[PDB]
Design a protein around this ligand. Sequence first.
Ligand SMILES: Cc1sc2c(c1C)C(c1ccc(Cl)cc1)=N[C@@H](CC(=O)OC(C)(C)C)c1[nH]nc(C)[n+]1-2
Length: 110
Amino acid sequence: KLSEHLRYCDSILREMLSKKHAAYAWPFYKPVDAEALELHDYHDIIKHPMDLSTVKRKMDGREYPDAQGFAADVRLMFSNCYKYNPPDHEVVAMARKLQDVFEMRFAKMP
Ligand SMILES: Cc1sc2c(c1C)C(c1ccc(Cl)cc1)=N[C@@H](CC(=O)OC(C)(C)C)c1[nH]nc(C)[n+]1-2
């Protein structure tokens, strides 16, 4: 069983993976495939990869002790994108749109 706040977190995750947000969320659905995208320095710059599928694996595996642990991974995913990319990159705008969803839903958690 998931914690009560973790159930809410799992619900936020389900929304982030859902068709509603797919126009901006899709780059975050799986780990960055550095070689497929020809980002040959990605793993040098980003030492701790994170993406929504990994958050799902961890949630399903009951790895998060609390909502804070969940949020730290979601924010890591966004932060990796901001860290790697020039701020004017299209993927940064997509990350930001998804983060707006995340931060709003997470903040509204009673
Ligand atoms: C599957 C994935 S994962 C991803 C991207 C894609 C495509 C995109 C991207 C996504 C959508 C649009 Cl319209 C454009 C780019 N950008 C790269 C970084 C980059 O420099 O890639 C290009 C070499 C420019 C492709 C990046 N950084 N962090 C992430 C999560 N991504």
